Amino acid sequence: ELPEDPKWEFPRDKLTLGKPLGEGCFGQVVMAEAVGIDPKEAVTVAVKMLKDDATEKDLSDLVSEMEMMKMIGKHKNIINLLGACTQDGPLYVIVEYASKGNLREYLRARRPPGEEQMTFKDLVSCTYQLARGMEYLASQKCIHRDLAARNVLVTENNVMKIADFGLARDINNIDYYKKTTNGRLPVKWMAPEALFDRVYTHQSDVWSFGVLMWEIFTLGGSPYPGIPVEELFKLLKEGHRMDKPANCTNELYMMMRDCWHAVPSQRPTFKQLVEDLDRILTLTTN
Amino acid sequence: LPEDPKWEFPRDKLTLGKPLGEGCFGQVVMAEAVGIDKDKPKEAVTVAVKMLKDDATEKDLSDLVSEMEMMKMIGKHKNIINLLGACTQDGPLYVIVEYASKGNLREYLRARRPPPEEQMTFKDLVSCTYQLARGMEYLASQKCIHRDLAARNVLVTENNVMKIADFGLARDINNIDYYKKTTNGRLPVKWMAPEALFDRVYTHQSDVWSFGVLMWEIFTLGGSPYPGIPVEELFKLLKEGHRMDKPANCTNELYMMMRDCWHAVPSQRPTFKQLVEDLDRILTLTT
């Protein structure tokens, strides 16, 4: 059913499945040891595979995620593809491992004891790292579409890496104007044009980057608290936007606000975000 | 969202309680509905409420709507989770359905496995199967195909009444896009009839296939269907005529019933009407 891709295929006998990773609602991910995936040494990786009650769509979805990841070059702030077992057996998609888990829970875990608390600098660095990851993704003609703290993983050394490319697409693989377009994107992280106009550009991702930022500086807070998704867009159209997180600088809040500009082209680019964040990061250090 | 007086229930007469289920594809919570039973205007009834998660998508919303509308079309039945009301104006959508204190059947059965916790008797298992056959018979008489029949989708009341739930994928028989490459693409494969994938059709006979798997689940006390067989290579095996073995504590007669349910030819599988009759016959002799 699946074609083999020599430059990615990995021997199953060379893979040892470990304990599960995550809640496992939308798939089955387990830790594992891959021998020679790097030449004869074992590497701790993560393997994405189907759940027992998976659908046909879950399969083609996973296959698509794998194919998208193949088109994304290696990058420090991106969970990259290491290989896959596609022949005679379940589909195993092997990607880089991040021991600290998703950013959302990571941020909630070190909230003020009222683990080591996150310093303001850490929050800036976190944001900075993810901005770099996105700048590279945009340079690769890739729109992630599902940016959110839950979709960011943290390594043992606190490196921030964008994950979950299930909804990600090449810039040209989006049907503009089709009523079904963007229908599977979480509403609270979604740019308005995504729904109203049925289009998706890199600027759409920066809108999402804005919500991710808010989540970061609230230390894992849930966006638009108390506001149900069925009522969110009317409000946004009326100009509504989330408030400045506590302890957040006005400068960083204004950055979030720029990301939430009604007009896509008036929002900053990931390149500009990377440059402003580098500046703020350096000033804090000094 | 449109106004449907017959089902609208006032938000202020509802008090959301603790979460129910795992909460993967939606949010369901326990709740107290005051006067949901028109004959008792001042009485608080414990109900279950389905709503969108914090990170729901547009599609989640239109699915919950559809699920609500399908439940409006399904008449009240003892062995079926029935719609009680809905809060559709000025606020988040709430789909108020019947509460089932003991949870889904799968977990319910696994919990009663030998080493609240009182083992299940053969009669219990057959009774359970009969109640569900009856629910599907009625459902079929309502022109409705469930499409997602499974133990995880059956709930049991405080009095151990079996009720078919989760109508998120259910359709009216005449509301299926036959032969479209996308049809049946969201159905758990291990419970899917072969034709649903190979032909992209879905009839009541497709549901009896699933009922057969549901039967295997019941008699294995919550066992995982096709153990060790990944979904990726299941349909190939099915074409070859592979079928699950008889559960240790199941009679030959009940296994033959499971096998009929998994007949390759849809029209050669029994109807829910017949399953009810044979199960009724078997349950009587036993009890």
UniProtKB/Swiss-Prot annotation, chain A:
Consequence of substituting N80T: Constitutive kinase activity
Effect of K57E: In FSPC; constitutive kinase activity
Active-site residue numbers: D146
PTM comment text: Autophosphorylated. Binding of FGF family members together with heparan sulfate proteoglycan or heparin promotes receptor dimerization and autophosphorylation on several tyrosine residues. Autophosphorylation occurs in trans between the two FGFR molecules present in the dimer. N-glycosylated in the endoplasmic reticulum. The N-glycan chains undergo further maturation to an Endo H-resistant form in the Golgi apparatus.
Residue numbers of Phosphotyrosine PTMs: Y176, Y177
Limits of the Protein kinase domain: 15-286
Residues noted as binding ATP in the record, renumbered to the chain: L21, G22, E23, G24, C25, F26, G27, Q28, V29, K48, E96, Y97, A98, N102
Consequence the record notes for mutating A148T: In LADD1; strongly reduced kinase activity
Topological domain ranges for the Cytoplasmic compartment: 1-286
Functional note: Tyrosine-protein kinase that acts as a cell-surface receptor for fibroblast growth factors and plays an essential role in the regulation of cell proliferation, differentiation, migration and apoptosis, and in the regulation of embryonic development. Required for normal embryonic patterning, trophoblast function, limb bud development, lung morphogenesis, osteogenesis and skin development. Plays an essential role in the regulation of osteoblast differentiation, proliferation and apoptosis, and is required for normal skeleton development.
Domain remarks: The second and third Ig-like domains directly interact with fibroblast growth factors (FGF) and heparan sulfate proteoglycans. Alternative splicing events affecting the third Ig-like domain are crucial for ligand selectivity.
Recorded disease: Crouzon syndrome: An autosomal dominant syndrome characterized by craniosynostosis, hypertelorism, exophthalmos and external strabismus, parrot-beaked nose, short upper lip, hypoplastic maxilla, and a relative mandibular prognathism.
Subunit structure of this chain's protein: Monomer. Homodimer after ligand binding. Interacts predominantly with FGF1 and FGF2, but can also interact with FGF3, FGF4, FGF6, FGF7, FGF8, FGF9, FGF10, FGF17, FGF18 and FGF22 (in vitro). Ligand specificity is determined by tissue-specific expression of isoforms, and differences in the third Ig-like domain are crucial for ligand specificity. Isoform 1 has high affinity for FGF1 and FGF2, but low affinity for FGF7. Isoform 3 has high affinity for FGF1 and FGF7, and has much higher affinity for FGF7 than isoform 1 (in vitro).
This protein's name: Fibroblast growth factor receptor 2
Organism: Homo sapiens
Shown residues within the full chain: 467 to 766 of 821
